[PDB]
Amino acid sequence: YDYHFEVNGTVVRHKNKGFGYMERFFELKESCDERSKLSKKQYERFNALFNFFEKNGVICMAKDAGTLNTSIEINSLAYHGKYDVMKKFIEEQSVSIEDDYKKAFFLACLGRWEESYDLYSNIILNSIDESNGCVYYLSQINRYRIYQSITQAVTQFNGLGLLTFGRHYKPFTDEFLARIEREMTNFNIDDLFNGMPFEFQKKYKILEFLSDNQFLYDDTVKLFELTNKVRSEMSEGSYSFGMSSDIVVLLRLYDNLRFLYENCLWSVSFHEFHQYIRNSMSLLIEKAEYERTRDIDELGFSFFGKKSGFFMEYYDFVNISRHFKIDDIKNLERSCSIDKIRFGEQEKIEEYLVGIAEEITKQFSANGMNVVFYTQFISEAKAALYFAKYVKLSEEGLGKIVKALLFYFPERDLDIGKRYVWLERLTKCNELPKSIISIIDDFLVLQAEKHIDQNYSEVSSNGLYSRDYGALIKHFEKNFISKRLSEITLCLTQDKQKQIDFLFKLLPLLSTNAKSHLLSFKSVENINDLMNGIRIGLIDEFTPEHEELIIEYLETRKVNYIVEKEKGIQTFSSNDYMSTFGIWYFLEEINNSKMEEFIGMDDQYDFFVDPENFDYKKFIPSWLKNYNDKLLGKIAGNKHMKHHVIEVLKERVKNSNDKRYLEILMNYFI
Amino acid sequence: YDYHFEVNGTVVRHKNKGFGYMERFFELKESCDERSKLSKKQYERFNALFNFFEKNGVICMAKDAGTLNTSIEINSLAYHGKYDVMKKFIEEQSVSIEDDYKKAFFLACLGRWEESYDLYSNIILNSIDESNGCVYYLSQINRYRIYQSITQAVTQFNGLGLLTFGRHYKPFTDEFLARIEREMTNFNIDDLFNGMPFEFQKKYKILEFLSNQFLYDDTVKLFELTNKVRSEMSEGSYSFGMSSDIVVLLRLYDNLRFLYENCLWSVSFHEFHQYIRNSMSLLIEKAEYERTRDIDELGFSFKSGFFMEYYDFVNISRHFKIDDIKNLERSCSIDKIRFGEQEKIEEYLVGIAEEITKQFSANGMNVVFYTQFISEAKAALYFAKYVKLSEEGLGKIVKALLFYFPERDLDIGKRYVWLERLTKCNELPKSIISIIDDFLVLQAEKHIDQNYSEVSSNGLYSRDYGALIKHFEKNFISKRLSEITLCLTQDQKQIDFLFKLLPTNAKSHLLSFKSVENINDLMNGIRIGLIDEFTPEHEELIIEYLETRKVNYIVEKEKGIQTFSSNDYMSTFGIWYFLEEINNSKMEEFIGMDDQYDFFVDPENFDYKKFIPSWLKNYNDKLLGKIAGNKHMKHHVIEVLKERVKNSNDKRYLEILMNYFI
Amino acid sequence: IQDTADVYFKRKSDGKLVFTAEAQTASFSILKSEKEINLTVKNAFFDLEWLASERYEVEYRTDIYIQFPNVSPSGEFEMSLENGPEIKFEALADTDTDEMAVVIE
Amino acid sequence: VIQDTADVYFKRKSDGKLVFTAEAQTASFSQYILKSEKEINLTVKNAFFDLEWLASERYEVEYRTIAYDIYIQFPNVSPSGEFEMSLEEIKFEALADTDTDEMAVVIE
């Protein structure tokens, strides 16, 4: 502890009670003529130490400090996702035991844990003879880590994973488990630094911090004090001169990432380190958004020349795309504004996503799905594809990405509606070529070929279906008629009526004779038929028989509700067509007194029938979320509900952070 | 680790693979008939362990237990600040070495640090062979911590304390410094758990927590729960049954009771204060998000508002800094929260007040109490602004902060800030009016000297105290100040002081003695209401001041000078011109380079791109009414406020919009 | 009127219970309305004779009953080095029988 | 354009004597007779104290950087003392005189 080695690269004397030998080293680095005063072997050693320090980037002291621009370098093929290259590297013949260590690291990264464990055991077998103690140390560390991996995989594998996949397919045999549990019985990891010889301690005293179950706990609290600093800084809003703490955070993060990944430790893939870099880059991007939004008046305007806003970089893109989770993406999406954030080096993102798409193509092309690689890969794939909505890419790479996500991806993990949401994000980022329209058409052909079963079930979490796919196709080009769907519709028979309903969801891309045959086979019977016929543009005005069916449905609903008044049922479903009827009455689309008799049922519909006699206390302003502009103007076309709605919207906007309701008040009420 | 023992008090079987002895233990606790089927030595052993478990609050397994209660109890004398009672107990008879350890913890907590170190060393010398190394372990840890505390204190004494006090003011000598240096040479901390014998390790491995990374794992757990709490804060959620705020609160109170009750000195340290800061701020933010959230049907299908306690008031006062609770003011509205137990708060705060009275009555000041206590006392008088006090306690607190608080640590205007905050809660008693009258007489007799100047960082001076007086009661006239100024001698600093602080017979002597002149003096005259209509000679004074201003601008525009005096008189003159109080056109004949002044003087000819929203921040209602009448000052200011409302998140611009422009 | 609720997860091909547990956390979200509910639930014991796709249903009880017949489990992968149990599942929505709010008071 | 790494000299109004030299990291400016309060806060690192000065009171701050020659002067200041202690930085705040309430001097 004689020197502070702060993260920028500069070194400050801390406890050197004598000659400034580090400063003398940099003084000898300053002059080649002073380097000539050394011996020849001393000159070679000085050159070696100079090469070591420029490899590790340690530059100068605070007395001669200048400008230290950052730089990101990672040479790990495992971090880059070059899976084929490391496959060929495993397939090569081993030359040294270090090459065997890299082979075992890549085998563990691919997830083939059995030969990884055996290869690590053989590395431990070899390393005794040559006295390579450090490689022995990290080999024992990785052995305990893969033991933790195997035990955790076994414990979570026999339980909820059976409900996840419907079958065990337990990857290992019991003899392998017996061998490891004999080898790792009552095994401490804290002993490890003590057990190594004394000269190993005296030289590798750095390496003691690896061996702890509380690994990176000091790293976590060193982050957390800085997070407190950043929170106080954004609350006050001060002018941070010198260098701000987020620079220290990013430099510490990149140093940890390079140290962990380059030295081939398996401990990178763990939940706690994922949480660490999660909140780390979350705090960094939230500070970036705050410094974008901030306003200044007098001195900061005199003091803020060349303010570097945070960009998007390929290392930052991978660090976002690997160790994240979708709920955290929604969390950062509620805050921030990612559209204002500049992106760069998008060709590297394009080739990384191309490598991801080809990897999942090779994985799901056959039935040889490695369960370990699947479990370690699909969440990273989900994070990368969800973060892909702010990058503009070329046509062919977008086509490969869309085809891979639509075809070679498990529907048991990602539903159809979430696929629709993700490609909707892709379409709002980048416009849609007609070949990709043909790709989506072939995707819907595959959906219909799944729909040929009379026992088939179509499941969507968010309730989005292929009608919305065809609606998006019409939204980018109304003129396109799917001829493949037209001849499929021409191939329909009488008994295929469920498939006829699924194609009835897909109206506007059909042919005239096929539409005539469909309308011959279609009859407006239930309320969902009315919802589809008003959804596909079939029904535009309201025939009286529609009113008869609606009043019959509401009569049955009132009979059931009078029955249920004895019992304890209040809410029914999300199929809330009754408030839609009240909306249509509010838009004067139905003017019958029979539905006016139906008041007193549900709070939305009771508001929409008689807003003057509505009890405003039961009004829920979250309903104000799910309205459109024309309905908001018609809402503005009534005095009585506005008399309370202005005050209610004011107290909701003032006492909360709803920017959408702020815009709702702003655009229409003033 | 055969069972998990969580903070609520329940037991979960984790690695217990043999006989279920803890479950059988609670089954034996269930039946008194099974309690009879035991040896009575073993039965009273069972009852003693039952008393132990109820002392530590272990209640059943998780399956056995139903509802649970949050219970809080602290028996520490230093927790409640019984300072004089601690003085008496220090002065009392010392027999037990456990009582000696408690007295040494008190002596460390009462600033006798070298004396406490001597007592710790004698405790070690007595407990050399006393058949329990627990006290030895605690005494060694506290000896190391007080060594580091003395070392860091003397290094901070060596540096900026000389700058703060104007004196080196060293309270220590090198004898015990060199003695503790050789005594703590090569003294590590992690060896100490190895230092005890084998059987002590085998019986007391639970005490490994005290062995340099204090609260490191607990801060890790606090951090991950902080991430979880903000993650569920970011959207709608329903934390059913156990909720994370209960976990945070129970972990906080468990750590605090374990540290305080066993008398460990490390509660003085900064990182524990950071721990309390983060935990309490997260709890406050949870309370705000609970009170402010929307209600859907399940919330109607399923209150639980946070209630502050006297323990919470102590936790607020001990471990906070003024800027952090200012940020707490910026985030959450504290004033809408429920309060209670006001008698304990009143006696605690008046105990702090009488401690301040005793310490600052005599000039002999001990710096250790000063440095450990001025932040806690400032935090206490900060957070006193949500407490309702009886007149005796309120008056004693007010006179203690007025007359005994050191003027180096607190500006007079800064004292006026706390006076404003305490007078917002309650009314102004006439006794308190007499107390602030005594304080202003003290200021008046301070102002006799021809070199005293009431420097105030906030710019609020002694007139604002009497302005507060007339804000509460205007028809009352100050009497003792009038009696002092009735004997005014014309031979002048104090004369101008009471000229500021004036608002008849007392006024007549001053008005005879005065000389109406200048600009800032005219600013004072219009501030106190002496000047109410602008005479032409006042307009001539403003004209010649703007002549001096344009001469200085002509000089300074040859070079680069940007900032000017903070008392922007010319901008206020332009305000008064567009408040239409002034009728002179020669002042607006020359355009002043202040952008607010150009904003005023050009009502439709000013470049709106250089407008500052903070100008709109610090205005008043009448200026907003004046700006509502200008058609050119409608569109640009409305769209600037629109974009500022859209970008930022503070609530003030919303009130600025809704007060006049909606 | 109480707060603590028990949850029952079962499968609607035989009406047989899969596991029982305690509720922890809910998550909410011709126009169209976009709301989505996901549930996180703490440690449980599974069905022993279950060991010898489909549709699944969830019951909540606290009398107050909250039931829904359209759920799917999502067991996300976890990787803990300390070690020493979480259940996450989401709701589903079909077309004709779209119904997820069964309430008994 | 400003490199945003300024340097601070801390002096005393008596003799113009330098008290110490440092560099600042955080500075915070915050908010008839129009009354407006403004507050300034400064934070520097572990400075270089003068042993010559080792051989209340009013002090001043100057704050120098380059914009391409930009100098800042605060005449009246108080170094408020915060005593802390821990295991194993100097803050200032402004002072406004009642005679001529000026705080910032800029030489460009």
Short mmCIF file of N, CA and C in Angstrom, two decimals, chain A residues 335-443:
data_model
loop_
_atom_site.label_atom_id
_atom_site.label_comp_id
_atom_site.label_asym_id
_atom_site.label_seq_id
_atom_site.Cartn_x
_atom_site.Cartn_y
_atom_site.Cartn_z
N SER A 335 -38.31 4.94 -17.58
CA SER A 335 -37.45 6.11 -17.50
C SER A 335 -36.81 6.33 -18.87
N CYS A 336 -35.89 7.30 -18.92
CA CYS A 336 -34.98 7.55 -20.04
C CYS A 336 -35.67 7.90 -21.35
N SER A 337 -34.87 8.07 -22.40
CA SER A 337 -35.39 8.21 -23.76
C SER A 337 -34.31 7.66 -24.68
N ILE A 338 -34.44 6.38 -25.04
CA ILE A 338 -33.37 5.70 -25.77
C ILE A 338 -33.32 6.13 -27.23
N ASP A 339 -34.41 6.69 -27.76
CA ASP A 339 -34.43 7.17 -29.13
C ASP A 339 -33.49 8.36 -29.32
N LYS A 340 -33.32 9.18 -28.29
CA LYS A 340 -32.39 10.30 -28.38
C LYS A 340 -30.94 9.88 -28.27
N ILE A 341 -30.67 8.64 -27.89
CA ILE A 341 -29.30 8.19 -27.69
C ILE A 341 -28.68 7.81 -29.03
N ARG A 342 -27.50 8.36 -29.30
CA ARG A 342 -26.78 8.05 -30.53
C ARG A 342 -26.24 6.63 -30.49
N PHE A 343 -26.27 5.96 -31.64
CA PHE A 343 -25.68 4.65 -31.82
C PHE A 343 -24.53 4.75 -32.82
N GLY A 344 -23.63 3.77 -32.76
CA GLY A 344 -22.49 3.75 -33.66
C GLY A 344 -21.97 2.34 -33.87
N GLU A 345 -21.14 2.21 -34.92
CA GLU A 345 -20.46 0.96 -35.30
C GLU A 345 -21.45 -0.17 -35.58
N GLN A 346 -22.56 0.18 -36.25
CA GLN A 346 -23.70 -0.72 -36.39
C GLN A 346 -23.41 -1.92 -37.28
N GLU A 347 -22.33 -1.88 -38.07
CA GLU A 347 -21.90 -3.05 -38.82
C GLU A 347 -21.43 -4.17 -37.89
N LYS A 348 -20.84 -3.81 -36.74
CA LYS A 348 -20.42 -4.83 -35.79
C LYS A 348 -21.62 -5.45 -35.09
N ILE A 349 -22.63 -4.64 -34.79
CA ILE A 349 -23.88 -5.15 -34.23
C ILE A 349 -24.57 -6.05 -35.24
N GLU A 350 -24.52 -5.67 -36.52
CA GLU A 350 -25.13 -6.46 -37.59
C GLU A 350 -24.45 -7.82 -37.72
N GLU A 351 -23.12 -7.85 -37.69
CA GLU A 351 -22.45 -9.14 -37.82
C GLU A 351 -22.58 -9.97 -36.55
N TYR A 352 -22.69 -9.33 -35.37
CA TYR A 352 -22.94 -10.10 -34.15
C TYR A 352 -24.33 -10.72 -34.17
N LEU A 353 -25.33 -9.97 -34.61
CA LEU A 353 -26.68 -10.51 -34.70
C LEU A 353 -26.80 -11.56 -35.78
N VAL A 354 -26.02 -11.42 -36.86
CA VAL A 354 -25.95 -12.45 -37.90
C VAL A 354 -25.36 -13.74 -37.33
N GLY A 355 -24.31 -13.60 -36.51
CA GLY A 355 -23.74 -14.77 -35.85
C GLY A 355 -24.70 -15.42 -34.87
N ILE A 356 -25.50 -14.61 -34.18
CA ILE A 356 -26.52 -15.13 -33.27
C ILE A 356 -27.58 -15.90 -34.05
N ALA A 357 -28.03 -15.33 -35.17
CA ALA A 357 -29.06 -15.97 -35.99
C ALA A 357 -28.56 -17.27 -36.60
N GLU A 358 -27.31 -17.29 -37.07
CA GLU A 358 -26.76 -18.52 -37.62
C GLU A 358 -26.53 -19.57 -36.54
N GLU A 359 -26.18 -19.13 -35.32
CA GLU A 359 -26.00 -20.06 -34.22
C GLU A 359 -27.31 -20.71 -33.82
N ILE A 360 -28.39 -19.93 -33.76
CA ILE A 360 -29.68 -20.53 -33.39
C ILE A 360 -30.23 -21.35 -34.56
N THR A 361 -29.84 -21.01 -35.80
CA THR A 361 -30.20 -21.82 -36.95
C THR A 361 -29.54 -23.19 -36.89
N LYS A 362 -28.25 -23.23 -36.57
CA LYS A 362 -27.55 -24.50 -36.43
C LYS A 362 -28.01 -25.27 -35.20
N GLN A 363 -28.44 -24.56 -34.16
CA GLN A 363 -28.91 -25.24 -32.96
C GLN A 363 -30.26 -25.91 -33.18
N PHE A 364 -31.20 -25.22 -33.82
CA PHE A 364 -32.54 -25.74 -33.98
C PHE A 364 -32.78 -26.36 -35.35
N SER A 365 -31.74 -26.49 -36.18
CA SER A 365 -31.89 -27.17 -37.46
C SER A 365 -32.14 -28.66 -37.27
N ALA A 366 -31.45 -29.28 -36.33
CA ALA A 366 -31.61 -30.68 -36.01
C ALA A 366 -32.27 -30.83 -34.64
N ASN A 367 -32.41 -32.07 -34.21
CA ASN A 367 -32.96 -32.37 -32.89
C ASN A 367 -31.89 -32.43 -31.81
N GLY A 368 -30.62 -32.22 -32.15
CA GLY A 368 -29.56 -32.22 -31.17
C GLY A 368 -29.47 -30.94 -30.37
N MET A 369 -30.47 -30.69 -29.53
CA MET A 369 -30.51 -29.48 -28.70
C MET A 369 -29.78 -29.76 -27.39
N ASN A 370 -28.62 -29.14 -27.21
CA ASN A 370 -27.90 -29.24 -25.95
C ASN A 370 -28.62 -28.41 -24.91
N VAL A 371 -29.12 -29.07 -23.86
CA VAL A 371 -29.98 -28.41 -22.88
C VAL A 371 -29.22 -27.35 -22.10
N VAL A 372 -27.94 -27.62 -21.80
CA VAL A 372 -27.11 -26.66 -21.08
C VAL A 372 -26.87 -25.42 -21.92
N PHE A 373 -26.53 -25.61 -23.20
CA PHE A 373 -26.31 -24.49 -24.10
C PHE A 373 -27.61 -23.73 -24.36
N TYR A 374 -28.73 -24.46 -24.43
CA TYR A 374 -30.04 -23.85 -24.60
C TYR A 374 -30.38 -22.94 -23.43
N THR A 375 -30.18 -23.43 -22.20
CA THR A 375 -30.51 -22.66 -21.01
C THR A 375 -29.58 -21.48 -20.84
N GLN A 376 -28.31 -21.63 -21.21
CA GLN A 376 -27.42 -20.49 -21.09
C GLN A 376 -27.50 -19.53 -22.27
N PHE A 377 -28.22 -19.88 -23.33
CA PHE A 377 -28.22 -19.07 -24.54
C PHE A 377 -29.50 -18.30 -24.79
N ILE A 378 -30.67 -18.87 -24.44
CA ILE A 378 -31.91 -18.29 -24.94
C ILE A 378 -32.23 -16.95 -24.28
N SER A 379 -31.87 -16.77 -23.01
CA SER A 379 -32.16 -15.51 -22.33
C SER A 379 -31.30 -14.38 -22.88
N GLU A 380 -30.03 -14.69 -23.18
CA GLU A 380 -29.16 -13.73 -23.85
C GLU A 380 -29.67 -13.40 -25.25
N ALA A 381 -30.22 -14.41 -25.94
CA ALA A 381 -30.82 -14.17 -27.25
C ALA A 381 -32.04 -13.25 -27.15
N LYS A 382 -32.87 -13.46 -26.13
CA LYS A 382 -34.04 -12.61 -25.91
C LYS A 382 -33.63 -11.17 -25.61
N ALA A 383 -32.60 -10.99 -24.78
CA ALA A 383 -32.13 -9.65 -24.44
C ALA A 383 -31.55 -8.93 -25.65
N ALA A 384 -30.76 -9.65 -26.47
CA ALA A 384 -30.18 -9.05 -27.66
C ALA A 384 -31.25 -8.67 -28.68
N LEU A 385 -32.24 -9.54 -28.89
CA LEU A 385 -33.27 -9.23 -29.87
C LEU A 385 -34.21 -8.14 -29.37
N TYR A 386 -34.43 -8.04 -28.06
CA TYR A 386 -35.27 -6.96 -27.58
C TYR A 386 -34.55 -5.62 -27.59
N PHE A 387 -33.24 -5.62 -27.34
CA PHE A 387 -32.49 -4.38 -27.47
C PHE A 387 -32.23 -4.00 -28.92
N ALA A 388 -32.47 -4.91 -29.86
CA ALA A 388 -32.27 -4.59 -31.28
C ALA A 388 -33.26 -3.52 -31.85
N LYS A 389 -34.14 -2.82 -31.13
CA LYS A 389 -35.14 -1.96 -31.76
C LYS A 389 -34.67 -0.53 -31.99
N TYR A 390 -33.41 -0.21 -31.73
CA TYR A 390 -32.91 1.14 -31.96
C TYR A 390 -31.69 1.13 -32.88
N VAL A 391 -31.48 0.05 -33.62
CA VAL A 391 -30.36 -0.08 -34.53
C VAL A 391 -30.91 -0.26 -35.94
N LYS A 392 -30.42 0.55 -36.88
CA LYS A 392 -30.80 0.43 -38.28
C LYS A 392 -29.82 -0.49 -38.99
N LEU A 393 -30.36 -1.50 -39.67
CA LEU A 393 -29.54 -2.52 -40.31
C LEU A 393 -29.91 -2.64 -41.78
N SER A 394 -29.06 -3.35 -42.52
CA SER A 394 -29.27 -3.56 -43.94
C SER A 394 -30.40 -4.55 -44.19
N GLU A 395 -30.78 -4.67 -45.47
CA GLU A 395 -31.93 -5.48 -45.86
C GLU A 395 -31.68 -6.96 -45.65
N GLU A 396 -30.50 -7.45 -46.05
CA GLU A 396 -30.24 -8.88 -46.01
C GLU A 396 -30.06 -9.39 -44.58
N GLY A 397 -29.38 -8.61 -43.74
CA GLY A 397 -29.24 -8.99 -42.34
C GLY A 397 -30.56 -8.95 -41.60
N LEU A 398 -31.40 -7.97 -41.91
CA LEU A 398 -32.74 -7.92 -41.34
C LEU A 398 -33.57 -9.11 -41.79
N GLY A 399 -33.40 -9.53 -43.05
CA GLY A 399 -34.11 -10.71 -43.53
C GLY A 399 -33.67 -11.98 -42.83
N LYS A 400 -32.36 -12.13 -42.61
CA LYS A 400 -31.86 -13.29 -41.88
C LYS A 400 -32.35 -13.29 -40.44
N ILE A 401 -32.36 -12.12 -39.80
CA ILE A 401 -32.81 -12.01 -38.41
C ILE A 401 -34.29 -12.33 -38.29
N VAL A 402 -35.10 -11.78 -39.20
CA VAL A 402 -36.54 -12.00 -39.18
C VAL A 402 -36.87 -13.46 -39.46
N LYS A 403 -36.19 -14.07 -40.44
CA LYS A 403 -36.45 -15.48 -40.76
C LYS A 403 -36.04 -16.40 -39.62
N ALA A 404 -34.90 -16.11 -38.98
CA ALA A 404 -34.45 -16.91 -37.85
C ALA A 404 -35.40 -16.79 -36.66
N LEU A 405 -35.87 -15.58 -36.37
CA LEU A 405 -36.75 -15.42 -35.22
C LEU A 405 -38.14 -15.98 -35.50
N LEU A 406 -38.60 -15.91 -36.75
CA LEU A 406 -39.93 -16.40 -37.06
C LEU A 406 -39.97 -17.92 -37.17
N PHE A 407 -38.90 -18.54 -37.66
CA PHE A 407 -38.94 -19.98 -37.91
C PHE A 407 -38.15 -20.78 -36.89
N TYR A 408 -36.85 -20.53 -36.76
CA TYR A 408 -36.00 -21.35 -35.90
C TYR A 408 -35.89 -20.72 -34.52
N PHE A 409 -37.02 -20.73 -33.81
CA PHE A 409 -37.06 -20.25 -32.45
C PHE A 409 -38.19 -20.99 -31.75
N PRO A 410 -38.00 -21.41 -30.50
CA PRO A 410 -39.03 -22.19 -29.80
C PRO A 410 -40.25 -21.34 -29.47
N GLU A 411 -41.41 -21.76 -29.96
CA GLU A 411 -42.65 -21.10 -29.60
C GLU A 411 -43.06 -21.39 -28.16
N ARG A 412 -42.51 -22.45 -27.55
CA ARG A 412 -42.77 -22.75 -26.15
C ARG A 412 -42.13 -21.75 -25.21
N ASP A 413 -41.16 -20.97 -25.68
CA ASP A 413 -40.52 -19.93 -24.88
C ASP A 413 -41.04 -18.54 -25.22
N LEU A 414 -41.15 -18.22 -26.50
CA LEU A 414 -41.68 -16.94 -26.95
C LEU A 414 -43.00 -17.18 -27.66
N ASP A 415 -44.05 -16.50 -27.20
CA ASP A 415 -45.35 -16.70 -27.81
C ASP A 415 -45.45 -15.95 -29.14
N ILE A 416 -46.54 -16.22 -29.86
CA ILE A 416 -46.77 -15.59 -31.16
C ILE A 416 -46.98 -14.09 -31.00
N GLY A 417 -47.74 -13.69 -29.98
CA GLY A 417 -48.00 -12.28 -29.76
C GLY A 417 -46.76 -11.50 -29.37
N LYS A 418 -45.88 -12.11 -28.57
CA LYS A 418 -44.63 -11.44 -28.24
C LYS A 418 -43.71 -11.36 -29.45
N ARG A 419 -43.79 -12.36 -30.34
CA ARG A 419 -43.09 -12.26 -31.62
C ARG A 419 -43.62 -11.11 -32.45
N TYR A 420 -44.94 -10.91 -32.42
CA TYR A 420 -45.55 -9.79 -33.14
C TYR A 420 -45.10 -8.46 -32.58
N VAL A 421 -45.02 -8.36 -31.25
CA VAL A 421 -44.54 -7.13 -30.59
C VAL A 421 -43.09 -6.86 -30.98
N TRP A 422 -42.28 -7.91 -31.03
CA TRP A 422 -40.86 -7.73 -31.34
C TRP A 422 -40.65 -7.33 -32.80
N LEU A 423 -41.41 -7.93 -33.72
CA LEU A 423 -41.28 -7.50 -35.11
C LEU A 423 -41.95 -6.16 -35.34
N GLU A 424 -42.92 -5.78 -34.50
CA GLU A 424 -43.47 -4.44 -34.55
C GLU A 424 -42.43 -3.41 -34.16
N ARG A 425 -41.61 -3.73 -33.15
CA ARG A 425 -40.48 -2.88 -32.81
C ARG A 425 -39.47 -2.82 -33.95
N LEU A 426 -39.28 -3.95 -34.64
CA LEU A 426 -38.39 -3.95 -35.80
C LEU A 426 -38.93 -3.11 -36.95
N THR A 427 -40.25 -3.11 -37.14
CA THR A 427 -40.82 -2.33 -38.24
C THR A 427 -40.84 -0.84 -37.91
N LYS A 428 -41.07 -0.48 -36.65
CA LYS A 428 -41.00 0.93 -36.30
C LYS A 428 -39.56 1.43 -36.29
N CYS A 429 -38.58 0.55 -36.10
CA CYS A 429 -37.20 0.98 -36.28
C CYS A 429 -36.86 1.15 -37.75
N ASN A 430 -37.08 0.11 -38.55
CA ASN A 430 -36.70 0.10 -39.96
C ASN A 430 -37.87 -0.33 -40.82
N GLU A 431 -38.00 0.30 -41.99
CA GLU A 431 -39.12 0.03 -42.88
C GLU A 431 -38.96 -1.35 -43.53
N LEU A 432 -40.04 -1.82 -44.15
CA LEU A 432 -40.19 -3.23 -44.49
C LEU A 432 -40.09 -3.45 -46.00
N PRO A 433 -39.05 -4.11 -46.49
CA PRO A 433 -39.01 -4.49 -47.91
C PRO A 433 -40.01 -5.59 -48.23
N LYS A 434 -40.35 -5.67 -49.52
CA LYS A 434 -41.42 -6.56 -49.98
C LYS A 434 -41.02 -8.02 -49.90
N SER A 435 -39.72 -8.32 -49.99
CA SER A 435 -39.27 -9.69 -49.78
C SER A 435 -39.51 -10.13 -48.34
N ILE A 436 -39.34 -9.20 -47.39
CA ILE A 436 -39.62 -9.49 -46.00
C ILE A 436 -41.12 -9.63 -45.78
N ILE A 437 -41.91 -8.90 -46.57
CA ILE A 437 -43.36 -9.08 -46.57
C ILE A 437 -43.72 -10.48 -47.04
N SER A 438 -43.02 -10.97 -48.06
CA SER A 438 -43.21 -12.35 -48.51
C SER A 438 -42.77 -13.35 -47.45
N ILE A 439 -41.73 -13.01 -46.68
CA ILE A 439 -41.27 -13.87 -45.58
C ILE A 439 -42.34 -13.97 -44.50
N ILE A 440 -42.94 -12.84 -44.13
CA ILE A 440 -44.02 -12.84 -43.14
C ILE A 440 -45.25 -13.57 -43.68
N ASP A 441 -45.50 -13.46 -44.99
CA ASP A 441 -46.58 -14.22 -45.62
C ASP A 441 -46.34 -15.72 -45.53
N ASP A 442 -45.10 -16.16 -45.75
CA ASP A 442 -44.78 -17.58 -45.61
C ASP A 442 -44.85 -18.02 -44.15
N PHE A 443 -44.54 -17.10 -43.22
CA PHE A 443 -44.71 -17.38 -41.80
C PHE A 443 -46.18 -17.62 -41.46
#
